[PDB]
Every structure is written in C-alpha cells, then in structure tokens.
C-alpha cells in the first residue's frame, strides 16, 4: 500500500493484511492477521499507537487518529464503517462502528456492540458489551438481538474474504 514510517516508528503489518495503495498508514501502527485497510482510509500513527486486531476492517474515507495519552486500540472481528472516524478510543471485539459515525477520546467500547450510523460516542464514554448505540451524543438504546450479535462477526468475516478477493484479483487499468 501507501505506507510511511515516521522517525523511529514504523508500521508493523502482518503479511496477510490488505492495505489499499490509496489508503495511508503512517508511523506507529499495528495491523494484525487477515485485517484490511480500504481505499482512502487514513491511519495516522504520529503520536500514540494505532493497533488493529485480527479480522478487523477499516473502510473507505475513514480516519483513525489519537491524542497524547489516548492511543487507538481496535479488537478482533471489528468493522469500521465507511467514512467513520475513531480518535484515541478503545474498541473491543466483535464491534460494528457505523458509517459516518464518530468515536471520541477516552471512549471505551465493549464487545459485541453496534454503533449506529452517524452516531457520536462522547469523549470518555464507556459502552457495555452487547449494546446498540444511537444518537448525538450517542447512547445505549437497547441490547443487541441474537441476529445482530451474529452479524457483529459475519460482517467482519465477509470483509476478510473481500480483502483476499482484492489481493488476488485486483488489477489497475
């Protein structure tokens, strides 16, 4: 992909990870196995680290950043929806970050959680496992259903396949 290293920090990207050449990864950024960074996404690891767990995907026009003392940590089987923005937050496993939504500094998102599209999780907000978050400021509206809890993973699995699909069949023309 389009990768840079800043000063001492250099990105650590597992070989099976997919990173679109139109995406931008800078500095201290960790990308685990079968992860994916899509077209025009930006992972700027120029102060605290940006860690992305396995089977996790960062969609298009998404931006990920941090603040002094607030690094961004993403768990496994996590989806970061198109045009979303995560700034110095901690996200657990099996989580869907809605499209064009915003997760702010100090935020702690639990596992098996869905954040609604366009939602804004306030700074230092703690979201319990199995929660559906909506609104601005975003808030827990109810617990996930079995079908949504199943989706919290399938969506990530779908992207693992997509990533592989681009690694092998993508071709510039």
Binding site, annotated residues for Ca(2+): 40, 61, 164
Long-range contacts of 69-74 (CB under 8 A, 24+ apart): 70/105, 70/106, 72/48, 74/50
Residues 95-134 that bind a second copy (CB under 8 A): 99-100, 102, 104, 117-118, 120
Distances (CA, A) of 139 to 24, 100, 109, 119: 31, 16, 12, 9
Judged by CB under 5 A, which of 16, 40, 49, 100 binds Ca ion?
Answer: 40
Instruction: Quote the least distance from Cβ 40 to Ca ion, whole Å.
Output: 4
Which of 61, 67 has the CB closer to Ca ion? 61
**36-75: which residues touch Zn ion (CB under 5 A)?**
65
Residues 127, 128, 129, 132: is their CA dihedral positive or negative?
negative
Binding-site size for Ca ion (CB under 5 A) equals 2
Closer residue to a second copy in complex, CB, 67/143:
67
Interface with a second copy by CB under 8 A: which range of 29-37, 57-65, 69-77, 106-114? 57-65
Per DSSP, 67 falls in state B
34 binds a second copy (CB under 8 A): no
Q: What is the DSSP letter of 54?
A: T
Is 125 a binding residue for Zn ion by CB under 5 A? The answer is no
For strand 95-97 and strand 79-80, is the pairing parallel, antiparallel, or unpaired?
parallel
Binding site for Ca ion (CB under 5 A): 40, 61
């Amino acid at each position: 992909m389009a990768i840079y290293e800043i000063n001492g920090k250099k990105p650590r990207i597992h070989p099976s990870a997919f990173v679109d050449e139109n995406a931008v990864v800078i500095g201290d950024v960790v990308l685990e196995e079968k992860t994916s960074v899509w077209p025009s996404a930006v992972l700027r690891g120029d102060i605290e680290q940006i860690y992305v767990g396995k089977y996790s995907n960062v969609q298009d026009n998404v931006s990920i950043h941090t603040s002094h003392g607030y690094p961004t940590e993403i768990g496994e089987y996590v989806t970061i929806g198109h045009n979303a923005m995560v700034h110095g937050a901690k996200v657990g496993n099996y989580v869907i970050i809605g499209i064009s939504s915003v997760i702010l500094d100090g935020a702690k998102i639990g596992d098996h959680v869905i954040i609604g599209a366009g939602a804004v999780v306030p700074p230092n907000k703690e979201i319990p496992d199995y929660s559906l978050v909506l609104g601005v400021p975003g808030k827990v509206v109810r617990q996930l259903t079995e079908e949504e809890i199943e989706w919290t993973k399938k969506n990530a699995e779908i992207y693992v396949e997509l990533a592989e699909k681009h690694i092998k069949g993508r071709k510039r023309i």
